Structure formats: C-alpha cells, structure tokens
C-alpha cells in the first residue's frame, strides 16, 4: 500500500556472520538524541529515504537495509557514542574496496543531524574478504623470497626527496645498501618530475641495487614508486621494473586510490614484484578523534586491496595500545576483540597473507631497543636522516643501524629486557663497533 | 621426533563442523573384514593427508589444520555393509573458484582404495566463504526471464533430430518451423559440434536466419542452443 | 672519518654484522631457538652468496637455498647436540660455510638463520 | 661544510609568488605554546623540504628551489589559536597531469605533523603553467549543451530508489518512465556498482533499452549515469567500454572512493570515445565537513576538474561558500573573493568547465530557489522527488519538468524568482494536474 | 557414453574398450612429444625413470617445499612433483612456488650435471 | 585376456610413459622393474621423504635400488625370482640402501 | 645419519651411481647390447655434463651430445672389439670421459647411454 508521503534502530537484531559490521562514533547535534543518531548512521548509508517511494513495494528492504543494532555512550564525551551498524553481504561488489568505501562512508558523513562521525572498525566477514586478492606475496612469502629470517627489515628513505639527478639519487641508494640495509625508498612524493624522470631514477636505483648486492652477497632492493596520474602510466612503471627484474616497487594507495591500487597489486602478484604502500594523505582523515575514519580501517582496506608493506606510523616514544592493535589487524591471521587496542570486533582473515609494517619518521640508532621491542621482527624499520645523517657518509650510517639492529636482536634473543636495557645493549654496542660510536654521539 | 613411519588421525566423531569447511556424505561399502571406523577414517585419510609411511617434512607444518576428518558414521536402513561416512575438509584446501580442484581434493583419489569395495558420493556442503569465489550462472533464472520477456509458464523447446544426417540448411529449416509454431528455443544435441557435412558455423549461420524469421513472424523472442 | 669496507665482508644475514660468535654466544642463540620451541637445522654451503644464473625475474635468486645437514632436530632439548652436529660439519666440509636455520610449525614456515662457520678464508 | 646531526628558513613573509608556484591557502590550528608563525613555517616545511637532521646530500642541490614557503600569515577573525597559512609550492615539485601527485605533494604529509592541533587546506592556486598539463573535463559544459542540444534551462536528473534490491529489468522500467515524463536523466546510485541479484551488464542493457525507448517517444534526447566505478582499473574500463559500444551519452564515476589514478583513465577514455563522465562525491564529507580539520570542498572541486569531469555533485541548498566554488567549477576566470571562499584568483586559461549537480531532499518547491542559486548551467537530481509523485515517474518527471520551466519562463520574463517562486509554483498548479498533485503532497 | 549408460532396460554398462582407426587418430596432435623424444630431450636410457611427489602435500610453504625438492633431485632422482590436489591455494600460490621449485631444478642439476625437472 | 578386445594400430603416433606410484618402496623395485620395463616412470613419495636419513639420502638409495635391478637384468637375472638378492647385494655398497631397506623389510 | 655429498660425485646417467664397473662388468653390459641385437657405440668429451649457454628454452640445454669416437660398430658380435676401441679411446685422450652408448634400427633411436672411463681427477 503505497501512499505518497514523508525502521532503522534494531536492537533486537542479531548479526549474521555474513554481514559487514560498522562501529562509528558519532556526535548528535543538539536535540538529537542518541538512538535516533544511531537510525540515522544506518539509514543515511543505506536504504533511507526522505520521501516514499512506491518502487520499494518491488523487493524486500529489511533484506537491503543498514541496521543500527547497538548504541553506547564514549568514556568521557558527554555527546559522542559508538553506534554498531550490519551491512548484509549482498550490499558490496566483491573484490571492490572502492564499493565497500562508497557503500559505507560514502555519504553519511555529510548528514545535518550528526554534527561529526568517525568510523572505527569494520568487520570484514570471511564470506567477502575471500573475494579479494589480498597481498601480493605477504610476510611470509616476502621472508623467503628475500631469504631474510629473525630481525626487523631496514631501509632508508632518500633525501632530498627532490633536487638530486637520477644518478647522484641512485649513488646515494648504493651507499646505504651496500653498508647493511635491505631497502631504499622513494619519498611518497617522487614520482616523476622535471630534473628526475621516474624511468631515469629506475636505471640508476637498478644499478645501485645489484651494485650493492654483488658487493655484500645480500638480497637487496630499492621501492620505486610507480604512483601516477593514471594507471597507464602507473603499470608502465611496473612494467618496466618487471623488466629490470628488481624486487620490489611502491604506491601511495590514498592518493593515487583504491581503484588503481587493486590492479597495481594483481600486477604485482602476476609479476612476482613485491609493494611497499606508503599511507601519504591519510592524517587528512585519521587524525581527529571526533571526525574522518581511525587508521585502522584504511589499514584493513589496504590488506584487502593489496599491499605487502604498509606504513604504521612511528609509535617511538618509550598511540603505543592503538597501533599495536591495527599492527596485529594487519598481521594475523585471527584477531580477537579488544577495545582496550581499539579492535571493535573480532577480525577472522581466514588465512589471507599478512602486511609488514613500516616504522619511520624521526628515529635513530637509540631508538632501535624501543622499536625493535614494539614491532618485533615482522616489521621494516626506515632510517632517512638517521642514516644520510651519519657524520661519516651513508655506508657507515647504514652499518650503524643494522649493527644497533643486531644488537639488540641478539640480547632479546638472550633473554633480555630491551624495554630496560635498551641503552645498556647500544652501549656496548658502541665497544666494537666505531661506526655505531660515531651514531650515537650525534643523536643522543 | 622424526621415525622410521607406518583412523589414529582421521575418525574424529568430536570435530565440531566448521562453517568455512566442506563437507561431503560418502555411501561407504567396507570390504570383507573392515570395521565401519576403520573405513570412514580411510575415506578422510586416502581423501587428504594420509600417508602410508612416516614423512618427516610433516613436521614443517601443523596437520591437524590441513587433514580431512569423518566426523560422524552412520549405518544405512537395511544393509549390513553400508554406511554414509561424513568428512570435513578445510577451506584452505581449495583453490578460489575451481570446480575442477574441488573435485580433485574430494574425489580424485579415495575411490580407489583397497580397503573400500565400493564408494559413492552423495552429497557436498558447500560454504558461502567458498562459493563467494565463484561467478556462477552467467545470468540464472530471474534475468533470463527478464531477458526474454518470458514469464508465468516453463519454457519449451525441441531437440533437433535426426541429430546427424541433415544439411545445415535442412537442420535450420527444421528450427524454424519449430520456433514459428509456439516453441522458445530449438536445440544441438549434445552430439552436434562440428562433423562432416555439417560443419558448426553453417549450422550457425542457418539456424540464426530460423531464429531471427519465426521472431519477426510470432513477434516473441526466439532461441536456438 | 672511516670507510666502510668494499671487499672481505660479505654477509649472511641475520646476525653477520655482529663480531665473530664465541661458543657461549652461540649456545645462547641456540637455546632461543628451543625455548621459542622451533626446530634447528643445519645448512652448508661451498659457495656462500646469492647469485642469479637461471633468472632475472622478480623474485627468482640462486644461492637462496644451501645444502642441508641431515634433518631438522625434531624434539631436541639440549642445545650442545647442535653444537656438537655443527663440529662434525665442519669436520667433514672444513671449506664451506655453515649456518643455522630454525622451522616453526606453527607458522609452518622458516623463521631463523644465522652464520655459524665460515672457512679459513672467508 | 657538512657538520651535523638533529621560522628560520620556511617562513618568507615578504616573498613575492611567481605565476608558476602552485599556492595554498592552509587554515592552521597551532598547539598550545606553538607562535603562529612557527606554526605556518611549519606547515611550510613539513609539506615540502623538512627534515629532521642534516644530511650531507642536501650539499649536491639548491635545496631553496624546492621548499615551500609560507609567505603569508594571518588570524581567522573569531579565533584565538587559528591562522590562514599561505604557502608557494615550485613548479617543479609537481608531476605534469597527476592530480594524484600534486594531493601528494601538498597534503600527504603535513596533516600529522603533532606541533599542529588541527589543519585544513582550503584552497589552491594552479598556475596556467601547471594545469594546461591536464585534459580537464572530456567535454565540458558548452559542449555537453550542443551534443544533448539542449538550451535555456537547468537539466533535470532522478536517482533511482531503492538503490539495491531492484532486479536490472525492474530498475531499467523505472528509468524509462522517469525519463518518458520529461526528464533529461536517470542516475545510478553511488553504491550501485555490480552486485549479487544486478550485475552490471544486465543493469546497462535495461537502461540502454529504456533510454532510447523514452527518446522515441518524446524525440528530444535521452541519457543515464552507468555507473562505471569498480575495483579494478580493469574492470571500469570494462563498463566504459560496454556503454560506448551501447551508444549511449553519459557513464559516471565516484572520483573519490575510485581514486583520482583511476578518475584520469576514466576522463581520458571518455574524451577519447565521446562519452560524457558524470561525477559523484562520493566520501567528500568524511574529508571536508569539519571546518577545523581536512580539506575543503572547493579544493576537491578543482582537483575533479583537473583530473576530468563533465557533472561534479555540489549540494542541495552554505550559500556564499557554494556560489564560490560552483564559479570555480564553471567559469574561466574567477577573481579573489573571501567573502565566498575564494582565496586565490584563479585563472584556467579555456579549461572546460564542469556542470554542478544538485540533489537530496528536493522537491517542486524548491525548483524557484535551485533555478535562481544555480542558473540554467547545473543539473537538478530528484530521487524521492519523483519516485514519491502519487501518480509514478512519469508524472513525478512531468511535475518537475513544467516547474522548472514555469520558473524559467517567469525568470526570462524579468520576475523576481527568490520572491515570487512560491507564487510561481501555485499558478504552474493550475494548469498542470501533474505538478498540482506533487505540491500538494511536499507542501 | 553421452547417453546409453541411462537407458532404464539396462541394469548396468560398462565400456571395456575402443577401436580407434587410423583414419580418426590421425585428427589428432596426440603426446606434444612421446617416448623417445621425451629420452632424448633429457639424455636419459637405459632404466625407469624416477621421482618423488613432495608430501604433505598441502601445509608447506613455497619455500620448504622447493627445499624437499632440492633434496630429492640432488640425490638421484629425474623428477619431484606436484600432487594432483595442488594447485594454487592459500600459503602456497602457485606462482611462488614454481619460482621456489625452479630454485630448486637448476641447483641440484648444476650439482649431479644430470638434467631435473619438477610436474 | 590382458583387456584388449580390439588390435589397436596408433600408425605412429607416439607412446606415453607409464607412471608407478601408491606406497611403493625400495623392495619393490625388482617387481616394478620386471613388470614395465625401462619405458616408465617410478614415483616414490612416502618412499623417499621416509627415509630416515632424509631426502637426498632416500633419493640415492632408490637410484641405487633401481641401477642394481637395471644391470642385473640386462646381464640376463630372473627379476621375479631373484629380486631380494639384487638389492640385498646393493646394500653391502651402498649404506643409503641399506638405512632403507631396515626400514620397510 | 650419514650426509649425501655435494661434490666429488657428479654424474653421468644410467649404472654411474653403482661403483666403478670393472672390466668384466663393462663387458656384459656391452653383451647386453650384442643380445639385444643394438649397436654399440662410443662417445668422448673433456665436458662431463650439461649447461644452458646457447639457450633456456623448455626443451634446450648444450653438452646433452658428447662426440663420437669412430663410428657405431654394425655387425659387431665380439664385446672383446668394444673393449679394445675403449683402450684405444683413452690412451688418445686420457683426459677425456668416454661412455658406451647404443642404437637401435628397429626403434630408430639411441636407447643405451652408460659412463665407461673417467679421467684421473674426475
Ligand atoms: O620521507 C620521510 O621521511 C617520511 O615519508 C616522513 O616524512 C613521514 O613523516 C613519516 O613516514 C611518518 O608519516 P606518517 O606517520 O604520516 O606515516
Ligand atoms: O542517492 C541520492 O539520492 C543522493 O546520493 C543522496 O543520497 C545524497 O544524500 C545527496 O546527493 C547529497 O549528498 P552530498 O551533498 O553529500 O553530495
Ligand atoms: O600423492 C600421491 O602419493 C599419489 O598421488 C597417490 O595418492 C595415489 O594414490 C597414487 O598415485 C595411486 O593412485 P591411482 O592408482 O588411483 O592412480
Ligand atoms: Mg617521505
Ligand atoms: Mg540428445
Ligand atoms: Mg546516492
Ligand atoms: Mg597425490
């Protein structure tokens, strides 16, 4: 019966293991109470409209409808809670990251009633994650390809990002490769430029890739990034890394999208070529605590779409719980609930490859207890300034960190207490090794 | 420790179904002598994990999460040597949308075991996290009614017959006058591919123009298999 | 200011950057591997790097793989029974290199390897 | 010499911008303690050239060609720790054609930096230099006006609804009769992609069917938004594909949600074939809602008209701040404006310009209002606003239709339509059974 | 045997064998190579040839199972292979493991000097 | 008697080698010798990562199995009859064969 | 637990992993052949085994054919004559592997292939 004219807050409902759950925090605005917020976080990403429309008397709604089956207040806001919302399965093109996005945040964050949303979680069900690729390799096969077992993997992150020729960019890379690090990187901004044209950079970092791993008798690689202003150009960059039979390239997943990013990591799976994904652009939407979405969601999507490295921030100091949550989201197999991580929901990844993390920013050889602590060995650890700043070149800054690294694997691997004896470890380090003296002098 | 080799790892009537396994019901016929145990722990062995004599390179990778388990027997209604064993079989055993796989883990090699006089396989569990990985009908029966404009009665056809013997043109001439007469569809047998003197793109070509005239003439959507 | 060297250091991974293991050391690196419940094994090699003579394609590396030294110590608790394996090794291959490996079943993978020899001359 | 280890170099307040640099306009809310000035310097360094410790390489280049610069510093009136930052970005920093790098570059690093409680970019001036790189919308609004031939008068769109849940043939019905009352479009919801119960290619044979089953009948011609958006680049090229060998008008794309990488293939694909690309904005919220944090509207606005587009969705009636960027999306050249958020003067050198899409909870009554805020060159989407009609979609179109040209003929004829528009409606009513019927019920 | 075997006068049916003539097998390529191409191809005569089908055959990463097949190629025998069941599934993709499995061929061939392969 | 009810003539297409397999071991390598011939395939799974000495070793002990059976067929010995000598006499050389054959008597 | 060795040990195909045949052995293996009604035939290289220099195409490795000693001796039904033609191979070239192959004209193809010499060293 239609009858033109101007369903949604279920607390009686019980999820289906099928269905994609949502946590958002939202902020009513005044007048709005909270179950009503909740309706709308459903409603406004889902089958809500404002007006009836005779066209719903063709199907079944409850079948297609978000449902907001859970509202509880946040531990401290007096105006913000976490509203629970199922998506039946039916609602997401399989294998799309870039529908899951638009079907759930693509446009309920703009509704009037709610003056700021966030969303914190989102369970993926085993049923739709098995439609996706996932990592073109993951940790595991990436240890064995690279045969690189017990210790967190280093890399130095070139400066300047922009102003070197291809070929003093690529004497820089040999520097830091041949004294003791895995990796080189391309800032997230380095794509292709006038003074460095990306295919000048790729034939330098090539020859300072096999330079330095014929000289050290170690795998070595370099993370050229293939980002681009369209996917044509962005495979012809693969391709010709392909062609170079190098290890591994990279992407900056936000800013060149979801879209392209899916089809850079089937490239990659197909090609054997390893991705590193740089998170540039996400503290445009992560950072604020009442509005945008919490990095762990991005960071799921981005196991979904396809990624072997992911950023995971710095965590340095001595948020430590929040990142080692979406740490173990990115990593395990099974993740069980823990809002004291910030985990909203049990995630079950039925035995997609897990992502290694990336550790950067700021950090030096003193750092190395703390992080190799935080991370443990399943991570990548990126020195720029803390190698290119060694006072004796790139070579001996590169020895400094993996000697540090070392260090401090080996006294864990003893049994010590690197939260405590961190220092302790560094020092005696310092003994042997004038190169790491040299490190920590400067940085202490 | 790893040594020498040679039901002790397949007949566990406590595994609990999980919602991601396959599960499959055998009608299992136990040679003279076999215990009903002993053969649906052979039916998830032989169809799985087991091996005749100790591997050591099994010791490189946790079993349990890749055997093939019966979890339950049971006897079947008037026979003495007839039982439908169940057995579950990880998700992680298959490879994402290959039919052809699934068979292979399942039923390519257990049928042939000694101990079993004879093995039927009645039934599969497929999980929705498995079928997912599937594309399935390219269209199914809800758009092909929409596609044909066809609904509210089960559609008809005729089987061309003589199935080999007729030129192409007599073959679609026979389409036609099927198709003109009330019918949807006219269709090969299964036999009709490419054969002498009749080869598969003539039939096409003149089994489209019967399609296409007993359109144009019923004024109904018309096809031909 | 010093200069990294570019010849005679070639490494083995994890670990090769540190000085020369003294049996102590060793035993201690060992014992990690057991307490950690992972199984060692040995491996040794006469050529000691990675190298790629049947390929160039991402990925693909000769030299990854070494020879193996018997099997892996399925259910060993005593640390000195590696040590005493890894002396006959290099009682039997004095010329070749020899390092430790450790398998976890769990993670059904390869999880440790480090130098543990290394010839007269290298 | 190089010696060592871990406001004085980023912040250049009489620094004059070259017409080449690529400028920013950041509004930056420092952390407690934190001079404004330090705060713009560094907004300027951590979105270029910033680094922690000295590094020897720097010494190989002229590392004062490649930094940003804030050159310019001042409060927002109202606020005692925000400042609009002004910073000058080098040419060279930018990869020619790639929306993507330039977001890179400009805000892919800086929004984390902690001496920042909170940022957001509001707007940016692209040089000539830098945007005649770009192909910019496949057609633009003066060419989609001569290939639709059609003249005068905002175009008139509805989404269908319910977005999912409808069989392909079904949702194919509805367009054809949305389209058959007057309407120019119908449109694929922003989630509807391909899904279990409409696949893609079902869904665009339907609608290809209903499209030209509608233009027979009325003779003036007909279009849908095809969804396109996918997860692979393969796939929406794929869809594109498909539509073109239809011979239809119009695919769409979720920029955002799809990513600008993708969006530019699209766009390219699009001018290639003669396809006109219909963009949704899809996630802008959850990016440009909050004033305090993210990134606002109009910077999203220009980056879609870089990256192409011939529709870009922008609201459903702030005003001020709307009438801005839809003159940022439209026109050539768009003269400095505060008042209406235009922090730069913008300069697009004959860069088509992209048609503005309205939507939400519209209705007959709005059509004065919608007519007088956006002018003949937008388009006007009405869901609810025409499935909801009493009578179906064809009358719900035929409703929409006559009001919008009882608004526009009143408007010609030199009739105040924010004062009249009321007044306007309920005279079309008289006359016209079919909009009597929709304002009696949205009233 | 599209269709006989379901004809309800028959209580079974079984086909024991084929005569194929020449004038039909002709229509077809048959073994890309056969026999005594397949002896000459890899220098092998004399006496069966040998291998090992690597075992357990799901649970093993790429990686350890080219180092299973290292081992038996290195040893003496012609041949390690794949088990039927193993194709591309989780934790082992079958890209992975023909890289790990080609690893494995070239360095126990450069070992004996006799040539190896792998199904 | 052996299935074939029809004289089969293949006009030169060639052959395919038949492949042994199942829980075969070192023991019955005289039998599977005698039984194709020289034109087969033998595959040993469980027969040669059972070894207790591993893969390598197994590997050597059914190459040796195999060789002995090989040489002493063609200096004209009964297989069928004098298979459990041939490999016993292998063993006394070859302590690969020998590890295997105390294993799977 | 006793360890396959990694050099030392290369080889040569059919009957090179039994120990060294002696005279006698070699001449009942070249009776074989007689019996059989093949033609023996011997071949000589200073290379022993196979490599991929020319090309790495499925199918294609170098050093797979040696080079004849003389020709196939047709006719022959003395293994004594194969023997004598071995002696004469390796005092010609003592530093060259030389191996007793077989034809068949019925199947048309080489079907014997086994090592008979070995120079000193190898
Ligand atoms: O070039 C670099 O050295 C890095 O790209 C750096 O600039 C970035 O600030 C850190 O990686 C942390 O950033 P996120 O926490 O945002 O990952
Ligand atoms: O499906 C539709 O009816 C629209 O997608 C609708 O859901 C949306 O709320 C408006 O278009 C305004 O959205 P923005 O102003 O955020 O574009
Ligand atoms: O993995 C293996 O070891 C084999 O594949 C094995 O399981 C199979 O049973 C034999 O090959 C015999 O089987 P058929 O005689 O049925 O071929
Ligand atoms: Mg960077
Ligand atoms: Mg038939
Ligand atoms: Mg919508
Ligand atoms: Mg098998």
Not at chain 1, 37 to 56: I, L, N, P, Y
Not at chain 1, 337 to 357: C, E, H, L, N, Y
Not at chain 1, 367 to 392: C, K, N, R, Y
């Amino acid at each position: 019966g239609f009858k033109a004219g101007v369903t949604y807050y279920t607390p009686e409902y019980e999820t289906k293991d099928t269905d994609i759950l949502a946590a958002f925090r939202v902020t009513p605005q005044p007048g709005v109470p909270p179950e009503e917020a909740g309706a709308a976080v459903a409603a406004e990403s889902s089958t809500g409209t404002w007006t009836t429309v005779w066209t719903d008397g063709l199907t079944s709604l409850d079948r297609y409808k978000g449902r907001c089956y859970h509202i509880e207040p946040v531990v401290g806001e007096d105006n913000q809670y976490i509203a629970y919302v199922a998506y039946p399965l039916d609602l997401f093109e399989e294998g799309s990251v870039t529908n899951m996005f638009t079907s759930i945040v693509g446009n309920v964050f703009g509704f009037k009633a709610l003056r700021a949303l966030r969303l914190e979680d989102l369970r993926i069900p085993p049923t739709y994650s098995k439609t996706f690729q996932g990592p073109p390799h993951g940790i595991q096969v990436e240890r064995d390809k690279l045969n690189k077992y017990g210790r967190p993997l280093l890399g130095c992150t070139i400066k300047p990002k922009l102003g070197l020729s291809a070929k003093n960019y690529g004497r820089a890379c040999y520097e830091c490769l041949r004294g003791g690090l895995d990796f080189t990187k391309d800032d997230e901004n380095v794509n292709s430029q006038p003074f460095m044209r990306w295919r000048d950079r790729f034939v330098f970092c090539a020859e300072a890739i096999y330079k330095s791993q014929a000289e050290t008798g170690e795998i070595k690689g370099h993370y050229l990034n293939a980002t681009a202003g369209t996917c044509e150009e962005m495979i012809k960059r693969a391709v010709f890394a392909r062609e170079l039979g190098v290890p591994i390239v990279m992407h900056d997943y936000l800013t060149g999208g979801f879209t392209a990013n899916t089809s850079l990591a089937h490239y990659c799976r197909d090609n054997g070529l390893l991705l590193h994904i740089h998170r540039a652009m996400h503290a445009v939407i992560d950072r604020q605590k009442n509005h945008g979405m919490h990095f762990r969601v991005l960071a799921k999507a981005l196991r979904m779409s396809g990624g072997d490295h992911i950023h995971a921030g710095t965590v340095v100091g001595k948020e430590r719980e929040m990142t080692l949550g979406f740490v173990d989201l990115l990593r395990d197999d099974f993740i069980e609930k823990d809002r004291a991580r910030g985990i909203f929901f049990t995630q079950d990844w039925v035995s997609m490859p897990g992502v290694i993390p990336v550790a950067s920013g700021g950090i030096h050889v003193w750092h190395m207890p703390a992080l190799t602590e935080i991370f443990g060995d399943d991570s990548v650890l990126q020195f720029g300034g803390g190698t290119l700043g060694h006072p004796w070149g790139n070579a001996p800054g590169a020895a400094a960190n993996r000697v540090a690294l070392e260090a401090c694997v080996q006294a864990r691997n003893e049994g010590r207490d690197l939260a405590r004896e961190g220092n302790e470890i560094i020092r005696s380090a310092c003994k042997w090794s004038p190169e790491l003296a040299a490190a920590c002098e400067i940085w202490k | 420790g790893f040594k020498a080799g040679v039901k002790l790892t397949y007949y566990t009537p406590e595994y609990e179904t999980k919602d991601t396994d396959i599960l499959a019901a055998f009608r299992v016929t136990p040679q003279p002598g076999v215990p009903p145990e002993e053969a649906g722990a052979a039916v998830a062995a032989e169809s799985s994990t087991g091996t005749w004599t100790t591997v050591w390179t099994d010791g490189l990778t946790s079993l349990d999460r890749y055997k093939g388990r019966c979890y339950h027997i049971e006897p079947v209604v008037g026979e003495d040597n007839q039982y439908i064993a169940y057995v579950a079989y990880p998700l992680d055993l298959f490879e994402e949308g290959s039919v052809t796989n699934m068979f292979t883990s399942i039923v390519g090699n257990v049928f042939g075991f000694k101990a079993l006089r004879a093995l039927r396989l009645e039934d599969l569990r497929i999980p929705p996290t498995y079928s997912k990985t599937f594309q399935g009908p390219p269209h199914g029966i809800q758009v092909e009614r929409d596609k044909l404009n066809k609904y509210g009665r089960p559609l008809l056809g005729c089987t061309i017959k003589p199935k080999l013997g007729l030129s192409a043109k007599n073959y679609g001439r026979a389409c036609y006058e099927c198709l003109r007469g009330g019918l949807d569809f006219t269709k090969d047998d299964e036999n009709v591919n490419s054969q002498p003197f009749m080869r598969w793109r003539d039939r096409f070509v003149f089994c489209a123009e019967a399609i296409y005239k007993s359109q144009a003439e019923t004024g109904e959507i018309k096809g031909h298999y | 200011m010093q200069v990294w060297p570019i010849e005679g250091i070639k490494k083995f991974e994890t670990l090769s950057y540190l000085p020369p293991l003294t049996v102590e050391d060793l035993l201690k690196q060992i014992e990690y591997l057991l307490r950690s419940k992972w199984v060692p094994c040995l491996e040794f090699s006469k050529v000691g790097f990675v190298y790629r003579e049947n390929h160039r394609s991402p990925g693909y590396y000769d030299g990854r793989y070494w020879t193996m030294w018997k099997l892996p110590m399925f259910g060993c608790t005593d640390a000195t029974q590696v040590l005493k394996e890894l002396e006959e090794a290099k009682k039997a291959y004095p010329d070749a290199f020899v390092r430790i490996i450790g398998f976890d079943n769990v993670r059904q993978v390869q999880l440790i390897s480090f130098i543990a020899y290394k010839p007269p001359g290298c």
